[PDB]
Design a binder for this molecule. Structure first.
Ligand SMILES: Nc1ncnc2c1ncn2[C@@H]1O[C@H](COP(=O)(O)OP(=O)(O)OP(=O)(O)O)[C@@H](O)[C@H]1O
Ligand SMILES: Nc1ncnc2c1ncn2[C@@H]1O[C@H](COP(=O)(O)O)[C@@H](O)[C@H]1O
Ligand SMILES: [Ca+2]
Ligand SMILES: [Mg+2]
Ligand SMILES: [Mg+2]
Lengths: 590, 548
């Protein structure tokens, strides 16, 4: 057929990825993402991950499968891109080539989809879901060939994974009765892959019964609209009454007006720090600060002490940190800048020792749940690479928001493995930043900036749910501006949020004059009071952060922060949510 | 004489309004008014909160010298505690009392003559700042409202825009006398029935002749000014006089929603509830004050150093206790004496008079408080038994001129039985009702409602989850001046998942409760760690402050 014509083509597909395994959602779904990157094209958009309920309310397999992967007949191009013309035109939505497969008209499509909806409704009369959408700049020719490959991808992994096609360019397709020859399937597969591997094919004939573009359930299932609203809010297919955002909002409002259900509440947005699910805005996590320079040189010393540094790492884990943020800068520890020690030499030994010391005192199989996520405050591609290659780190914390070296973004993807990234807003360096303070609209300039970085990383296949925002308190902000940023923190209610107020100069600015600091050298009695005040002022920001549902706070003082967060969590922990009005009523009757 | 100066002594119920213009001395003006009322009219058996009021559309050393040279009342003062007042119960019902000696009018005529006063005064105000308001119930020995108005006007002249006292009610009576002309010597004769006359009495009696033109019971504006209804709602919400549509509460509620419906303004916004710690106005729910804990155990000199440290670290109030073998007296009195010496020795800055902390004494011992009060050493009684241990202590909350404030805390048992007395049918409301009952008892005994502070007593006869539950439900006190002490208590540790470690976690858990208290607008918090608490409160205050 025209299906097999070897003239190279660039198509835009939109996929849905589903699983119901809570514990392994991330590994399952990220495995599927990578086989889609490998066997289909380039991932150029992702939604958040979502824990979904229906609208009314086995692992070692994978790790071994990655070695025995059949090669693609197309080479995957890791190169960074700034835009993508085909995607820009898919959104317009401008003139593309005619569909290879036969297209149905709007009316017939709708009727065919409605049939499937009512027929499946009757069957269900005779669960937690984990959902994610993706956009693929695809080299595959047509929706059906893609479905054949999708089916193969599924079978390589096998209800553990369900991959659907939601859109494929601007086409409207309904194909009724699909009889596929095991030899026609092979020719499609061999068109894209360097090919028992026959039982796989035999399973597929039964599987592809029909084909629907857009997918049947596209506007009917909230979870799909929910995902598509992150990626392509303004998009309008010929088959839909309105744009994706407009459809999504109507669903939310109608569910509210007609059934008195808040559909948002049952359908949770997820971010991923490492390998497990985190529910957006459901926990304030403590990130422990380990500054190697401060640990070593601030008392007057001239040598790095990796042991002392690793002692502090364990002290933080015990004090209640979930994440450790480790950083160094290239510094000259003598009077003359004559000899100096590199960032690599500051951070990698400490990371190496921590990893060694972890694998020892872990003697029981049980103490591995207690393993902190590891974040590295670096803008250096080489530092990050050695960390990632020797499995020393989980998260890139990039205070330039990946603008120092955008190639650092390539190191956030391996094959199977994805790493998470913090992007922070700043201007200049520590020497210049205090003067770089003019903003046309402080709150929204920083937000738009961070949003643009996200769009860039998302365009290059960094999964949306792995990107965290940091407003960079104290970095090119006057003290009143750091305060204004906190005042307007709600502006990040849709996003994973990572902040760092700890011990910054704007805290002292909140005090009018009208032991929590462990001393490195002897400061005066008057300076000790000021440090107490600052760490306490910080604990006030922890409280504020707690109530504002900030996802991650970066602190020097873990024990103190944890104490605060434990007490606020307890106060919020209520057994019976209406017992307040029930007890009140009982008193009124008494 | 005419049965107006009838020799028979009766007991009537009067409801008064007390108003002033001056914010700075409001408390003093009004409490001087209060004391003269206790002196000259009968017994105060109820009071409203103090209120800051904006009208419906959109120096003081004289007083201190006045209080020395007051004519004695011919009627007697009785400080014994009462449990009930039948005359007052009769007024509330409203059951049968003696016939009004003053000619009454019917509902129809009263309403006409009121509207008439309204329209004539609406016209002069159309031909043309802040008010401080308080109401009281007096069980009076004065025979009739006109006599009462005569004595009221004497009080007003003694104090002389400064003070304005009105009769809101006087039993069940309805009275509208249109043209009052009173002889100079009839005024003397009324005043002489109630007050042992002979300073400069002849000339003030001249002033009063001009002053009484008419008499309206109920007062013309009773139902027509928000500030009057606001006050009365505190005291007598279920009261229904013959001349009113419904009860005071209903009349209050209907005035509130009417301002919302017809004008889109929350009337509550510019009409603020006040409580008083020492001598100044505090706006309810507008500041979380820090109370520094001074626990005395053994040196006076070191303790007084700790006090000065706390003042500088930002404590508004110091709360001193010895009672948690030298006596409680011997622990706390010398410290408080030394403090007051040391404070007076630094008169090197004459302008620090409002830099002085309010002093609170944690005691249930009458003898200790008696010595504190006699020697002007304290401002506030912090009674952890809510004055149930020795209710005679309530007598010490009034000197002639002066009123003292009081914290009423809830507990059960003593420090050794406490932990076992933990059963409650309805924890949050049991404690609330208990504190309301205690408040009702002091208010009945003439303690200003606005000087009474509530403490849920965290950790006293509460399991840890109960202490938490009390915090979770702190909103229950949104109407009340609230004082809480969580600091270093055992339940803080209950929230968490080498020995200076637990000490740290406790202080920091305390700082979490400081944050919560701030957002829940708790009026006073009792802490060991003043600097730390102040740092939290300053930061949270900055974040809340939007300036343009
Ligand atoms: N129940 C009452 N209490 C006090 N004064 C009254 C009463 N009924 C009538 N009056 C008269 O109202 C007149 C005005 O009194 P004044 O201006 O001193 O205070 P007021 O107007 O009663 O106070 P407010 O402005 O709060 O109503 C006086 O001549 C007084 O005799
Ligand atoms: N756009 C589409 N994407 C994925 N599957 C589809 C689509 N249109 C039709 N199908 C069919 O839907 C059926 C049910 O799929 P599943 O629910 O994954 O078992 C299969 O027979 C698919 O061939
Ligand atoms: Ca009296
Ligand atoms: Mg499917
Ligand atoms: Mg008056």
């Amino acid at each position: 057929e025209l299906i097999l014509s070897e003239e190279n083509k660039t198509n835009i597909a939109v996929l849905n990825l589903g699983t119901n395994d809570r514990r392994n959602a991330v590994l399952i779904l990220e495995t599927a993402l990578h086989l889609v990157e490998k066997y289909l094209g380039k991932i150029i958009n992702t939604s958040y991950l979502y824990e979904t309920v229906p609208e009314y309310i086995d692992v070692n397999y994978i790790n071994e499968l990655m070695q025995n992967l059949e090669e693609s007949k197309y080479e995957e191009n890791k190169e960074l891109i700034d835009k993508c013309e085909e995607y820009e035109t898919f959104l317009k939505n401008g003139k593309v080539d005619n569909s290879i497969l036969k297209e149905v008209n709007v009316e017939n499509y709708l009727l065919e989809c409605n049939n499937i909806i009512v027929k499946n409704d009757e069957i269900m009369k005779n669960s937690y879901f984990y959902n994610l959408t993706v956009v693929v700049k695809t080299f595959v020719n047509d929706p059906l060939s893609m479905l054949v490959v999708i089916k193969y991808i599924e079978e390589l992994m096998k209800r553990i994974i369900d991959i659907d096609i939601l859109f494929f360019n601007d086409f409207t397709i309904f194909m009724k009765n699909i009889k596929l020859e095991k030899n026609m399937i092979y020719k499609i597969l061999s068109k894209y892959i360097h090919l028992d591997p026959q039982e796989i094919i035999n399973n597929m004939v039964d599987n592809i019964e029909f084909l629907s573009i857009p997918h049947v359930y596209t506007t009917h299932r909230y979870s799909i609209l929910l995902c598509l609203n992150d990626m392509i809010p303004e998009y309008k297919h010929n088959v839909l009454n309105n744009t994706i955002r407009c459809l999504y909002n109507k669903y939310v409002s109608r569910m509210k007006e007609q059934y008195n259900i808040n559909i948002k509440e049952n359908n949770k947005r997820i971010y991923v720090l490492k390998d497990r699910i985190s529910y957006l805005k459901e926990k304030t996590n403590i990130v422990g600060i380990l500054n190697v320079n401060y640990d070593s040189f601030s008392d007057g010393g001239i040598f790095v002490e990796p042991k002392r540094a690793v002692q502090r790492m364990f002290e933080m884990i015990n004090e209640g940190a979930s994440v450790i943020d480790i950083g160094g800068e290239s510094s000259a520890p003598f009077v003359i800048p004559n000899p100096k020690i590199s960032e690599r030499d500051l951070v990698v030994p400490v990371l190496q020792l921590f990893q060694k010391e972890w694998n020892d005192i872990k003697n029981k199989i049980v103490k591995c749940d207690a393993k902190p996520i590891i974040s590295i405050d670096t803008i250096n591609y080489n530092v990050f690479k050695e960390c990632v290659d020797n499995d020393l780190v989980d998260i890139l914390n990039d205070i330039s928001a990946c603008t120092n070296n955008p190639e650092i973004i390539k190191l956030l993807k391996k094959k199977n493995k994805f790493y998470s990234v913090v992007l922070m807003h700043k201007r200049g360096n520590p020497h210049t930043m205090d003067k770089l303070t003019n903003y046309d609209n402080l709150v929204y300039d920083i937000k738009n900036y961070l949003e643009q970085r996200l769009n860039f990383l998302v365009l290059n296949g960094i999964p949306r749910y792995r990107i965290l925002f940091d407003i960079g308190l104290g970095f090119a902000k006057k003290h009143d501006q750091s305060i204004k940023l906190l005042q307007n923190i709600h502006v990040y209610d849709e996003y994973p949020l990572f902040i760092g107020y700890s011990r910054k100069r704007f805290i002292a600015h909140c005090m009018n004059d009208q032991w929590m600091f462990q001393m490195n050298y002897m400061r005066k009695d008057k300076d000790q009071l000021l440090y107490q005040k600052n760490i306490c002022g910080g604990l006030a920001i922890a409280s504020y952060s707690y109530y504002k549902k900030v996802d991650l706070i970066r602190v020097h003082d873990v024990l103190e922060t944890k104490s605060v967060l434990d007490v606020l969590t307890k106060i919020d922990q209520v057994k019976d949510p209406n017992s307040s009005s029930v007890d009140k009523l009982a008193a009124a009757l008494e």
